[PDB]
């Protein structure tokens, strides 16, 4: 008349802070460009969208 109760669940493995995957949903992208416009004798570096 002896009953044994078996349990089992799932946890995150200890080494998962390094070996893990991230599932992302990525929407429309945006282009941001770096230019080196040179007018006359003056050079400028600018970042524009």
């Amino acid at each position: 008349e002896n009953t044994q109760l078996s349990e089992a669940y799932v946890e995150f493995a200890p080494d998962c802070t390094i070996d893990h995957a991230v599932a992302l949903k990525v929407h429309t992208a945006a282009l941001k460009v770096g230019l080196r416009i040179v007018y006359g004798n003056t050079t400028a570096h600018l970042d524009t969208f």
Binding site: A13, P14, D15, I18, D19
Partner: protein, 53 residues
């Protein structure tokens, strides 16, 4: 809070699937887990005994 006081801790006896006589037996060094995620070839082994104390 995680404790490093092993005076509160005791080793136990596990059930090993393969003892020295190729038979299952109760062992004081039963292997519970083995972890191999290192890129240089090292493994982490858990055992029913307590080393360094």
């Amino acid at each position: 809070s995680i404790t490093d006081d092993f005076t509160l801790t005791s080793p136990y006896l596990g059930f090993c699937p393969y003892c020295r006589h190729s038979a299952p037996c109760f062992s004081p060094i039963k292997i519970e887990n083995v972890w191999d995620e290192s890129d240089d070839g090292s493994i982490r082994i858990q055992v029913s005994a307590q080393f360094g104390y």
